[PDB]
Amino acid sequence: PKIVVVGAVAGGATCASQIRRLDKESDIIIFEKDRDMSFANSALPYVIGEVVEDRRYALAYTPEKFYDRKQITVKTYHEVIAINDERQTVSVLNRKTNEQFEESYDKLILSPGASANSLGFESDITFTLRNLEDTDAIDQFIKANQVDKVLVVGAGYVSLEVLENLYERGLHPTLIHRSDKINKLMDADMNQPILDELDKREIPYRLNEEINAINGNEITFKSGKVEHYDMIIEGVGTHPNSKFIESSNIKLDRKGFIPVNDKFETNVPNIYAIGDIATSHYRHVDLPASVPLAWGAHRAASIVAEQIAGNDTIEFKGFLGNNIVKFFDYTFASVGVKPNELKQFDYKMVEVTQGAHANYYPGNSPLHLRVYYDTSNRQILRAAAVGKEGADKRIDVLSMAMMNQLTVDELTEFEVAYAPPYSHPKDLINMIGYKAK
Amino acid sequence: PKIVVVGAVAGGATCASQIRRLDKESDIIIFEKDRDMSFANSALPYVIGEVVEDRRYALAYTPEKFYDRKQITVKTYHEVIAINDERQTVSVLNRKTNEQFEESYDKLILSPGASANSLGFESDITFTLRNLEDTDAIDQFIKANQVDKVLVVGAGYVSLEVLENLYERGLHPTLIHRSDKINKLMDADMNQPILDELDKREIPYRLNEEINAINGNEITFKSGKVEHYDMIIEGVGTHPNSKFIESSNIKLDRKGFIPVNDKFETNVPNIYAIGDIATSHYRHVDLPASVPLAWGAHRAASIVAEQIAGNDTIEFKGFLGNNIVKFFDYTFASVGVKPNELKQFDYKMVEVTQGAHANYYPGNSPLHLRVYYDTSNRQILRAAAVGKEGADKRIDVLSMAMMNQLTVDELTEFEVAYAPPYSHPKDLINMIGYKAK
Ligand SMILES: Cc1cc2nc3c(=O)[nH]c(=O)nc-3n(C[C@H](O)[C@H](O)[C@H](O)COP(=O)(O)OP(=O)(O)OC[C@H]3O[C@@H](n4cnc5c(N)ncnc54)[C@H](O)[C@@H]3O)c2cc1C
Ligand SMILES: Cc1cc2nc3c(=O)[nH]c(=O)nc-3n(C[C@H](O)[C@H](O)[C@H](O)COP(=O)(O)OP(=O)(O)OC[C@H]3O[C@@H](n4cnc5c(N)ncnc54)[C@H](O)[C@@H]3O)c2cc1C
Ligand SMILES: [Cl-]
Ligand SMILES: [Cl-]
Ligand SMILES: [Cl-]
Ligand SMILES: [Cl-]
Ligand SMILES: [Mg+2]
Ligand SMILES: [Mg+2]
């Protein structure tokens, strides 16, 4: 079938590649509105911190390379501006010429993702981060202005990674956030180490703080404070890239995302939507979910490839929402329903704080693991772990347990890999099970 | 009931403590033939290495402390020499006075463990490592003789830990083993990094090599080589401590272990066996299993405590044989049936080697993950992982998958915690699922 993919990055290039693995005959074209395909979105903060030095590390492919290797055509600086879904074509603006044309399809895959929000100030010193053009502009500006003091606005996990990288590069960031709900995928009492790590490094922060006005480099804040900053990086949320879809028959929710079934189909035949634009449901509970992270983009890209060109019985089973961030010496990881969704259930909480590994073994640190379960059926609803060591291991185990709607009591039965450097004969996970009675 | 426990360490002291948590009235007496109770067995190689130097980590209690805390009587230097099951007593030898006496019981719990094998040479410089008296004797002999050159015999995970520790202490060990089958819980072609780590550090080794004769410090070998060593530590396997059980009605297998049901009962009413002495079955396949490791001793201790004084519906579900060892910069872990047991199934193998975390992100190291699955039902039989980073995490997640009867194909659905320090958007585990078929 002739395949048109919109977006050439985490969902779209992956989906196209997966289809080509299954099907060597079909014509596949991807349209990408910006300069680069297949950049490593998650590497971008580390490119700013110069922790990833070789900036080609964050760019897997050029169009010429993709055609050479996979016989897939990728057109950059080509923005899909309308879907003419009844005629099965898309309208495409060639952004270099400002001429538009239609591209026909038998199957359309929409992976256009999300764009950064802006606070909307008229300011040359403010930047957002979503692609490699942005990473380049930020790096350029730091060098051209010898940036030292940088205001980081927003306290979500990417803004935090940007802050850390700026600090390691030698700059002096201050963090602000409009509320006290920092790193909101993690339980709010368990985010305290973020604020400790900032305090330990004397990196200033102010929560429930916002920009009121910008006059050149002089920033006035809601608190009444006035400070000079050489550069501002705004991490103030994202919005779905669906304006080009509104005129078509595809159903959007009230926020502009595309609800999909378990085959990533939209309500319109022959159109699929994957990645951050798609909304689905949890695997382990009957609630809607949106989980705009890399794993879901790559997983949906594979399921859609199977749907189109492989085994059409392969269908998504829903999300668990496994997520994680590093901030300085700590890891913060959670999975399951979000904090604010716990109230849809009758639930209890169990938690342990114990050494990541045997206490006498050096380099130990306290790991805090918390699990919420549903009192009607003992099923695990959510887990969270924070520590210098071992958080990602416990959370990945519990994601595997929730995939199987395992109960909290069955955690006593989990058979850990135990030697002194790694865990305890009764691992933290087992202790949750023992403590749940 | 009146409770007698034989062995006061990983299974026996734990079990007695767990009973006391549930039942504050029963009399509970533990007999231990050696000097110490509740030593940390897995800490021992690290004690020898001066990695663990605080005594309070090597030894958790004395009998007087245990009594004061838990009103459990522990008689060290008391060796049970017969089990008089028809009269419900044990015959005990007080090794201090060399007098024996009968002790009556209502419930008897056998946790005698295993003893180290010896090569049988008449040698003042040769030591085995099983307990804290052993550990003290080795540390004292190094100090009394200004030991520099130590021969480590055997290549099991305990000999390998002892080798690493003697090296970190500043001594000069050489490793030998009778064959090339080193570290045999791991797939024989995934142990090369043990030899690479020995070479990198210029620590000599010889395989297919044995001690042929000893004359003082002059050791003559099977190869014909003749060398001088200051000390020898022999790690040439263990044998079950069951010769004292053989006159009783308790059924032993031909290898001298005690088979038990899922309540850890023996064939004799009111007698339980737990820890290294006990044999049971795999959880995920219908085959016998013995897994002489700390998790099993601790989980059996809990189940027995429930049987006697708590919820007697709690039963064992079988072993998976999760196991792990550190050797210098590498981790070696595996779970499921042993390599020799794979031939009892029609199976296939799938593997992947990939960075532990994102390709672009620094500090990376390749992680080799291998999965065997049953072709009759696509169930996972065995998994094994070796790498500097992330092998513990992948093997615990697969331990949890095997607990939940996951097929290899379902591993594409595992939702990993992804950010660049931790994994990839399709983790190694997901790659095994995609590469299967
Ligand atoms: C800085 C940063 C760090 C992140 N870190 C992590 C992390 O550690 N872990 C994690 O799991 N996720 C992380 N993410 C999120 C992850 O990158 C996304 O979930 C993933 O990119 C979703 O894939 P997608 O295909 O939907 O969107 P994208 O990868 O963003 O690709 C969408 C593409 O579509 C193009 N497009 C949009 N509209 C059109 C149109 N009309 N015509 C042509 N092209 C169009 C866009 O230009 C864009 O290139 C991070 C994201 C960022 C920005
Ligand atoms: C050096 C070393 C390192 C290890 N490292 C690991 C590791 O990293 N991970 C892991 O999981 N496991 C490790 N193990 C194994 C783990 O310690 C054993 O699986 C666990 O100790 C088994 O508990 P048990 O109660 O059966 O035996 P033990 O803990 O050995 O206790 C048995 C006790 O019974 C006593 N006893 C025997 N017979 C009698 C008798 N007739 N009368 C009175 N008392 C008697 C013995 O003297 C002994 O003290 C290690 C073991 C050693 C020796
Ligand atoms: Cl990435
Ligand atoms: Cl149309
Ligand atoms: Cl231990
Ligand atoms: Cl008798
Ligand atoms: Mg139209
Ligand atoms: Mg259909």
Short mmCIF file of all heavy atoms in Angstrom, two decimals, chain A residues 42 283 295 298-299 320-322 331 360 392-393 396 399 413-415 417-418 422 425-426 434, chain B residues 42 283 295 298-299 317 320-322 331 360 392-393 396 399 413-415 417-418 422 425-426 434:
data_model
loop_
_atom_site.label_atom_id
_atom_site.label_comp_id
_atom_site.label_asym_id
_atom_site.label_seq_id
_atom_site.Cartn_x
_atom_site.Cartn_y
_atom_site.Cartn_z
N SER A 42 15.36 12.85 23.44
CA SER A 42 15.76 12.71 24.82
C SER A 42 17.22 13.08 25.06
O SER A 42 17.61 13.33 26.21
CB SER A 42 15.42 11.31 25.34
OG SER A 42 16.05 10.37 24.51
N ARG A 283 -3.54 -0.10 30.91
CA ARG A 283 -3.65 -1.52 30.78
C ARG A 283 -4.34 -2.17 31.98
O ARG A 283 -4.98 -3.26 31.86
CB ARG A 283 -2.21 -2.12 30.60
CG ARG A 283 -2.19 -3.62 30.51
CD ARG A 283 -0.82 -4.09 30.13
NE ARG A 283 -0.87 -5.54 30.13
CZ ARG A 283 -0.31 -6.31 29.23
NH1 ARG A 283 0.45 -5.77 28.27
NH2 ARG A 283 -0.44 -7.66 29.33
N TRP A 295 8.74 5.43 24.86
CA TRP A 295 8.39 4.01 24.79
C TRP A 295 7.10 3.83 24.00
O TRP A 295 7.03 2.96 23.21
CB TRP A 295 8.26 3.32 26.21
CG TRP A 295 7.93 1.84 26.11
CD1 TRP A 295 8.84 0.76 26.04
CD2 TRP A 295 6.62 1.24 26.08
NE1 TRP A 295 8.12 -0.41 25.92
CE2 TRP A 295 6.79 -0.15 25.97
CE3 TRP A 295 5.33 1.76 26.08
CZ2 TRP A 295 5.70 -1.03 25.89
CZ3 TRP A 295 4.25 0.92 26.06
CH2 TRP A 295 4.45 -0.48 25.93
N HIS A 298 7.53 4.34 20.22
CA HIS A 298 8.16 3.20 19.55
C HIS A 298 7.22 1.97 19.58
O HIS A 298 7.20 1.19 18.62
CB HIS A 298 9.45 2.89 20.31
CG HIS A 298 10.54 3.79 19.93
ND1 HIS A 298 11.62 3.35 19.17
CD2 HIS A 298 10.72 5.12 20.11
CE1 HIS A 298 12.40 4.38 18.90
NE2 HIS A 298 11.89 5.47 19.43
N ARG A 299 6.46 1.76 20.67
CA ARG A 299 5.59 0.57 20.72
C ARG A 299 4.42 0.65 19.72
O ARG A 299 4.20 -0.28 18.92
CB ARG A 299 5.06 0.32 22.16
CG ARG A 299 4.04 -0.86 22.28
CD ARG A 299 4.75 -2.21 21.95
NE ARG A 299 3.78 -3.29 21.91
CZ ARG A 299 3.82 -4.29 21.00
NH1 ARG A 299 4.84 -4.43 20.18
NH2 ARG A 299 2.84 -5.20 20.93
N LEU A 320 0.89 1.66 31.07
CA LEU A 320 1.04 1.67 32.54
C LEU A 320 1.58 3.03 33.02
O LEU A 320 1.46 3.34 34.20
CB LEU A 320 1.99 0.53 33.00
CG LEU A 320 1.39 -0.89 32.74
CD1 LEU A 320 2.49 -1.94 33.04
CD2 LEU A 320 0.20 -1.12 33.69
N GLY A 321 2.18 3.79 32.12
CA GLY A 321 2.75 5.08 32.45
C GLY A 321 4.05 5.00 33.22
O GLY A 321 4.28 5.78 34.16
N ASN A 322 4.94 4.07 32.84
CA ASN A 322 6.28 3.99 33.47
C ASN A 322 7.11 5.16 33.02
O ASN A 322 7.14 5.50 31.83
CB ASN A 322 6.94 2.67 33.06
CG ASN A 322 8.04 2.22 34.02
OD1 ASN A 322 8.58 1.03 33.87
ND2 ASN A 322 8.42 3.08 34.96
N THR A 331 17.48 9.38 41.44
CA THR A 331 16.60 8.88 40.40
C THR A 331 15.15 8.91 40.97
O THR A 331 14.97 8.58 42.16
CB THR A 331 16.93 7.41 40.04
OG1 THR A 331 18.24 7.33 39.45
CG2 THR A 331 15.90 6.79 39.06
N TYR A 360 26.19 -3.36 54.82
CA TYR A 360 27.63 -3.39 55.03
C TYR A 360 28.40 -3.26 53.77
O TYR A 360 29.64 -3.21 53.78
CB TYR A 360 28.01 -4.75 55.63
CG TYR A 360 27.52 -5.95 54.86
CD1 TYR A 360 28.15 -6.35 53.69
CD2 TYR A 360 26.45 -6.66 55.33
CE1 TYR A 360 27.70 -7.48 53.00
CE2 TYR A 360 25.96 -7.76 54.67
CZ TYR A 360 26.61 -8.16 53.52
OH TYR A 360 26.15 -9.26 52.91
N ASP A 392 15.30 2.55 39.47
CA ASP A 392 14.81 2.13 38.16
C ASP A 392 14.60 0.60 38.21
O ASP A 392 13.68 0.09 37.57
CB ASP A 392 15.81 2.51 37.05
CG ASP A 392 17.28 2.14 37.42
OD1 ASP A 392 17.76 2.34 38.59
OD2 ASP A 392 18.01 1.63 36.54
N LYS A 393 15.48 -0.12 38.92
CA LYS A 393 15.30 -1.63 38.97
C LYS A 393 13.94 -2.02 39.65
O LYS A 393 13.15 -2.83 39.10
CB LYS A 393 16.48 -2.29 39.79
CG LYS A 393 16.26 -3.80 39.92
CD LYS A 393 17.64 -4.47 40.23
CE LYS A 393 18.06 -4.15 41.68
NZ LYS A 393 19.37 -4.89 42.00
N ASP A 396 10.90 -0.92 37.33
CA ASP A 396 10.74 -1.81 36.16
C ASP A 396 10.16 -3.17 36.59
O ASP A 396 9.31 -3.78 35.87
CB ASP A 396 12.05 -2.08 35.37
CG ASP A 396 12.40 -0.91 34.36
OD1 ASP A 396 11.45 -0.13 34.10
OD2 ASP A 396 13.52 -0.94 33.78
N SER A 399 6.51 -2.54 37.10
CA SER A 399 5.78 -2.43 35.84
C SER A 399 5.48 -3.85 35.25
O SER A 399 4.33 -4.12 34.85
CB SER A 399 6.68 -1.62 34.86
OG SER A 399 6.03 -1.64 33.60
N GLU A 413 6.43 -13.11 47.01
CA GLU A 413 6.91 -14.25 46.25
C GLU A 413 7.96 -13.92 45.18
O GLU A 413 8.47 -14.86 44.44
CB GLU A 413 5.74 -14.88 45.47
CG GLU A 413 4.61 -15.37 46.45
CD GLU A 413 3.39 -15.79 45.71
OE1 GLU A 413 3.45 -15.88 44.47
OE2 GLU A 413 2.36 -15.95 46.43
N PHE A 414 8.19 -12.62 45.01
CA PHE A 414 9.14 -12.21 44.00
C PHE A 414 10.55 -12.70 44.34
O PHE A 414 11.04 -12.44 45.43
CB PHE A 414 9.10 -10.64 43.87
CG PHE A 414 10.34 -10.06 43.21
CD1 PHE A 414 10.60 -10.40 41.88
CD2 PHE A 414 11.19 -9.20 43.87
CE1 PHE A 414 11.72 -9.83 41.22
CE2 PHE A 414 12.32 -8.63 43.28
CZ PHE A 414 12.62 -8.98 41.94
N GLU A 415 11.23 -13.39 43.40
CA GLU A 415 12.57 -14.00 43.67
C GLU A 415 13.62 -13.09 43.10
O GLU A 415 13.90 -13.12 41.89
CB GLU A 415 12.62 -15.45 43.06
CG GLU A 415 13.85 -16.23 43.49
CD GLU A 415 13.84 -17.63 43.05
OE1 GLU A 415 12.77 -18.26 42.98
OE2 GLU A 415 14.97 -18.10 42.74
N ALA A 417 17.39 -11.31 42.49
CA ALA A 417 18.84 -11.68 42.33
C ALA A 417 19.57 -11.08 43.51
O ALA A 417 19.77 -9.81 43.58
CB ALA A 417 19.39 -11.10 41.01
N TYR A 418 19.96 -11.96 44.47
CA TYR A 418 20.63 -11.34 45.65
C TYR A 418 22.12 -11.72 45.71
O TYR A 418 22.48 -12.93 45.73
CB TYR A 418 20.01 -11.83 46.99
CG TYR A 418 20.90 -11.45 48.13
CD1 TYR A 418 21.06 -10.10 48.49
CD2 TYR A 418 21.60 -12.44 48.88
CE1 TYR A 418 21.95 -9.70 49.51
CE2 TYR A 418 22.50 -12.05 49.94
CZ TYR A 418 22.67 -10.69 50.24
OH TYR A 418 23.51 -10.19 51.20
N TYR A 422 23.80 -5.80 45.40
CA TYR A 422 22.62 -5.61 44.53
C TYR A 422 21.26 -5.42 45.25
O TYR A 422 20.35 -4.79 44.67
CB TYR A 422 22.49 -6.77 43.56
CG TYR A 422 23.73 -6.94 42.70
CD1 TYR A 422 24.64 -7.96 43.01
CD2 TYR A 422 24.04 -6.05 41.64
CE1 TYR A 422 25.81 -8.13 42.28
CE2 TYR A 422 25.23 -6.21 40.88
CZ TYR A 422 26.09 -7.25 41.21
OH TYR A 422 27.21 -7.38 40.50
N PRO A 425 18.37 -10.39 50.93
CA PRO A 425 17.62 -11.67 50.86
C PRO A 425 16.06 -11.47 50.82
O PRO A 425 15.36 -12.20 50.13
CB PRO A 425 18.06 -12.36 52.13
CG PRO A 425 19.53 -11.87 52.31
CD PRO A 425 19.34 -10.39 52.02
N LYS A 426 15.54 -10.49 51.58
CA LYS A 426 14.16 -10.00 51.43
C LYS A 426 14.28 -8.64 50.80
O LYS A 426 14.70 -7.69 51.46
CB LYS A 426 13.42 -9.91 52.80
CG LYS A 426 13.29 -11.21 53.54
CD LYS A 426 12.48 -11.10 54.86
CE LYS A 426 13.32 -10.85 56.16
NZ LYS A 426 14.45 -11.82 56.55
N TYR A 434 5.24 -8.10 52.53
CA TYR A 434 5.13 -8.57 53.93
C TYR A 434 4.40 -7.52 54.75
O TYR A 434 3.77 -7.87 55.73
CB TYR A 434 6.48 -8.92 54.56
CG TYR A 434 7.11 -10.16 53.98
CD1 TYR A 434 8.29 -10.08 53.27
CD2 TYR A 434 6.52 -11.45 54.17
CE1 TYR A 434 8.87 -11.23 52.73
CE2 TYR A 434 7.09 -12.56 53.61
CZ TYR A 434 8.25 -12.49 52.94
OH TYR A 434 8.82 -13.63 52.40
N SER B 42 27.00 -14.04 53.25
CA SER B 42 27.41 -13.47 51.99
C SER B 42 28.40 -12.33 52.16
O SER B 42 29.04 -11.91 51.18
CB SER B 42 26.19 -13.00 51.20
OG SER B 42 25.46 -12.11 51.99
N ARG B 283 9.05 -23.31 39.92
CA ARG B 283 7.78 -22.62 39.83
C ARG B 283 7.17 -22.71 38.41
O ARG B 283 5.96 -22.89 38.24
CB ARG B 283 7.93 -21.15 40.32
CG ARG B 283 6.60 -20.39 40.09
CD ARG B 283 6.60 -18.99 40.81
NE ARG B 283 5.28 -18.39 40.59
CZ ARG B 283 4.65 -17.59 41.49
NH1 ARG B 283 5.23 -17.30 42.64
NH2 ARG B 283 3.40 -17.13 41.24
N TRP B 295 17.90 -16.02 49.30
CA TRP B 295 16.44 -15.72 49.15
C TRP B 295 15.55 -16.88 49.57
O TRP B 295 14.55 -16.66 50.26
CB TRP B 295 16.15 -15.33 47.67
CG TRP B 295 14.73 -14.94 47.51
CD1 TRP B 295 14.20 -13.71 47.68
CD2 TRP B 295 13.66 -15.83 47.19
NE1 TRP B 295 12.83 -13.77 47.48
CE2 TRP B 295 12.48 -15.05 47.16
CE3 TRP B 295 13.61 -17.19 46.87
CZ2 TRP B 295 11.19 -15.64 46.87
CZ3 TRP B 295 12.40 -17.77 46.53
CH2 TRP B 295 11.19 -16.99 46.55
N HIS B 298 15.43 -17.46 53.40
CA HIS B 298 14.56 -16.47 54.00
C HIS B 298 13.07 -16.62 53.64
O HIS B 298 12.20 -16.48 54.53
CB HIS B 298 15.04 -15.04 53.65
CG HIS B 298 16.25 -14.69 54.38
ND1 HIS B 298 16.27 -13.72 55.36
CD2 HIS B 298 17.51 -15.20 54.30
CE1 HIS B 298 17.51 -13.62 55.81
NE2 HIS B 298 18.25 -14.53 55.24
N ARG B 299 12.78 -17.03 52.41
CA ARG B 299 11.38 -17.14 52.07
C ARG B 299 10.82 -18.38 52.75
O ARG B 299 9.70 -18.33 53.30
CB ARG B 299 11.24 -17.28 50.52
CG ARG B 299 9.78 -17.71 50.03
CD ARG B 299 8.91 -16.41 50.34
NE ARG B 299 7.53 -16.73 50.02
CZ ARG B 299 6.47 -16.32 50.72
NH1 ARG B 299 6.61 -15.47 51.71
NH2 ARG B 299 5.22 -16.76 50.35
N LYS B 317 5.48 -21.56 46.05
CA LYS B 317 5.02 -21.86 44.70
C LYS B 317 6.16 -22.42 43.82
O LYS B 317 6.02 -22.55 42.59
CB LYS B 317 4.37 -20.59 44.11
CG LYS B 317 3.02 -20.31 44.89
CD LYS B 317 2.24 -19.25 44.21
CE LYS B 317 0.88 -19.26 44.90
NZ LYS B 317 0.62 -17.89 45.46
N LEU B 320 12.56 -20.16 41.20
CA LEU B 320 12.97 -19.82 39.80
C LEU B 320 14.50 -19.96 39.63
O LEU B 320 14.99 -19.98 38.49
CB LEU B 320 12.52 -18.43 39.40
CG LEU B 320 10.98 -18.25 39.26
CD1 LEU B 320 10.62 -16.74 39.09
CD2 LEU B 320 10.51 -19.14 38.07
N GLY B 321 15.23 -20.00 40.73
CA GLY B 321 16.74 -19.98 40.68
C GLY B 321 17.39 -18.74 40.15
O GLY B 321 18.44 -18.81 39.46
N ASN B 322 16.95 -17.59 40.65
CA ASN B 322 17.56 -16.27 40.33
C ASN B 322 18.85 -16.23 41.12
O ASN B 322 18.88 -16.58 42.32
CB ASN B 322 16.58 -15.12 40.73
CG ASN B 322 16.92 -13.80 40.03
OD1 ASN B 322 16.15 -12.78 40.05
ND2 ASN B 322 18.02 -13.81 39.39
N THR B 331 28.86 -7.88 36.18
CA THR B 331 27.83 -8.54 36.89
C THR B 331 27.37 -9.69 36.03
O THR B 331 27.27 -9.52 34.81
CB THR B 331 26.58 -7.57 37.09
OG1 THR B 331 26.92 -6.51 38.02
CG2 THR B 331 25.36 -8.36 37.63
N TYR B 360 23.98 7.17 22.86
CA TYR B 360 24.67 8.47 22.87
C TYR B 360 25.14 8.92 24.22
O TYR B 360 25.89 9.89 24.32
CB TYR B 360 23.74 9.59 22.32
CG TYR B 360 22.33 9.68 22.92
CD1 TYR B 360 22.12 10.29 24.14
CD2 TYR B 360 21.23 9.14 22.23
CE1 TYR B 360 20.84 10.39 24.71
CE2 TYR B 360 19.92 9.22 22.79
CZ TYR B 360 19.78 9.84 24.03
OH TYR B 360 18.54 9.94 24.55
N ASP B 392 21.59 -6.95 36.55
CA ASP B 392 20.64 -7.17 37.70
C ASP B 392 19.17 -6.71 37.34
O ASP B 392 18.20 -7.38 37.66
CB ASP B 392 21.06 -6.65 39.10
CG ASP B 392 21.50 -5.21 39.09
OD1 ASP B 392 22.11 -4.79 38.10
OD2 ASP B 392 21.29 -4.49 40.11
N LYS B 393 19.06 -5.53 36.78
CA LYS B 393 17.76 -4.98 36.48
C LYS B 393 17.07 -5.92 35.48
O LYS B 393 15.89 -6.25 35.68
CB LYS B 393 17.90 -3.62 35.83
CG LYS B 393 16.46 -3.09 35.41
CD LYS B 393 16.49 -1.49 35.37
CE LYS B 393 17.45 -1.05 34.25
NZ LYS B 393 17.37 0.45 34.03
N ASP B 396 16.09 -9.38 37.25
CA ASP B 396 14.90 -9.28 38.13
C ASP B 396 13.56 -9.07 37.37
O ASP B 396 12.52 -9.59 37.74
CB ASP B 396 15.18 -8.11 39.12
CG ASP B 396 16.07 -8.52 40.30
OD1 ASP B 396 16.37 -9.71 40.49
OD2 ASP B 396 16.46 -7.55 41.07
N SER B 399 12.78 -12.43 36.09
CA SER B 399 12.26 -13.24 37.23
C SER B 399 10.75 -12.98 37.43
O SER B 399 9.86 -13.93 37.49
CB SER B 399 13.06 -13.00 38.51
OG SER B 399 12.50 -13.82 39.55
N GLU B 413 5.76 -6.13 25.07
CA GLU B 413 4.75 -5.30 25.76
C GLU B 413 5.21 -4.75 27.07
O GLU B 413 4.50 -3.91 27.71
CB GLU B 413 3.51 -6.11 26.05
CG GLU B 413 2.92 -6.78 24.75
CD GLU B 413 1.67 -7.61 25.05
OE1 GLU B 413 1.29 -7.82 26.22
OE2 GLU B 413 1.05 -8.09 24.10
N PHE B 414 6.42 -5.18 27.50
CA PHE B 414 7.00 -4.71 28.73
C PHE B 414 7.27 -3.22 28.60
O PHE B 414 8.00 -2.76 27.73
CB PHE B 414 8.32 -5.46 29.01
CG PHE B 414 9.21 -4.78 30.05
CD1 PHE B 414 8.78 -4.52 31.34
CD2 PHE B 414 10.44 -4.35 29.67
CE1 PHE B 414 9.71 -3.80 32.30
CE2 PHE B 414 11.32 -3.67 30.58
CZ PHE B 414 10.95 -3.46 31.93
N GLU B 415 6.68 -2.47 29.52
CA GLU B 415 6.84 -0.97 29.46
C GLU B 415 7.93 -0.54 30.43
O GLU B 415 7.73 -0.38 31.66
CB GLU B 415 5.51 -0.27 29.78
CG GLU B 415 5.52 1.27 29.62
CD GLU B 415 4.14 1.90 29.89
OE1 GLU B 415 3.08 1.20 29.54
OE2 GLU B 415 4.09 3.12 30.28
N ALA B 417 10.99 1.85 32.09
CA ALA B 417 11.26 3.21 32.50
C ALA B 417 12.44 3.72 31.67
O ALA B 417 13.60 3.29 31.89
CB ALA B 417 11.62 3.29 34.00
N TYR B 418 12.11 4.62 30.73
CA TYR B 418 13.11 5.14 29.79
C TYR B 418 13.42 6.63 30.02
O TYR B 418 12.55 7.50 29.94
CB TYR B 418 12.73 4.97 28.31
CG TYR B 418 13.71 5.76 27.51
CD1 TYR B 418 15.04 5.30 27.41
CD2 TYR B 418 13.29 6.93 26.81
CE1 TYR B 418 16.02 6.02 26.67
CE2 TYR B 418 14.26 7.64 26.03
CZ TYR B 418 15.63 7.17 26.00
OH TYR B 418 16.65 7.83 25.29
N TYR B 422 19.23 5.28 31.64
CA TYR B 422 18.68 4.05 32.21
C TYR B 422 18.42 2.90 31.24
O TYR B 422 18.46 1.73 31.66
CB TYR B 422 17.35 4.32 32.95
CG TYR B 422 17.53 5.40 34.05
CD1 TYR B 422 17.13 6.70 33.83
CD2 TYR B 422 18.28 5.10 35.23
CE1 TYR B 422 17.32 7.72 34.82
CE2 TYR B 422 18.41 6.08 36.27
CZ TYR B 422 18.03 7.37 36.02
OH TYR B 422 18.23 8.29 36.99
N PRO B 425 14.20 3.35 24.38
CA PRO B 425 12.79 3.32 24.09
C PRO B 425 12.29 1.91 23.80
O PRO B 425 11.18 1.63 24.21
CB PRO B 425 12.65 4.22 22.83
CG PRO B 425 13.77 5.22 23.03
CD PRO B 425 14.93 4.39 23.65
N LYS B 426 13.05 1.05 23.09
CA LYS B 426 12.77 -0.39 23.12
C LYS B 426 13.90 -1.01 23.93
O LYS B 426 15.12 -0.98 23.51
CB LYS B 426 12.64 -0.99 21.71
CG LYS B 426 11.31 -0.61 20.96
CD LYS B 426 11.14 -1.16 19.53
CE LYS B 426 12.17 -0.67 18.52
NZ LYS B 426 11.95 0.70 17.90
N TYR B 434 10.72 -8.89 20.24
CA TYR B 434 10.67 -8.64 18.79
C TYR B 434 11.54 -9.67 18.00
O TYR B 434 11.13 -10.09 16.93
CB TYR B 434 11.13 -7.24 18.44
CG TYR B 434 10.18 -6.16 18.93
CD1 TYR B 434 10.60 -5.22 19.84
CD2 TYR B 434 8.87 -6.09 18.43
CE1 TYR B 434 9.72 -4.20 20.29
CE2 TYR B 434 7.94 -5.08 18.84
CZ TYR B 434 8.39 -4.14 19.79
OH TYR B 434 7.57 -3.14 20.29
#
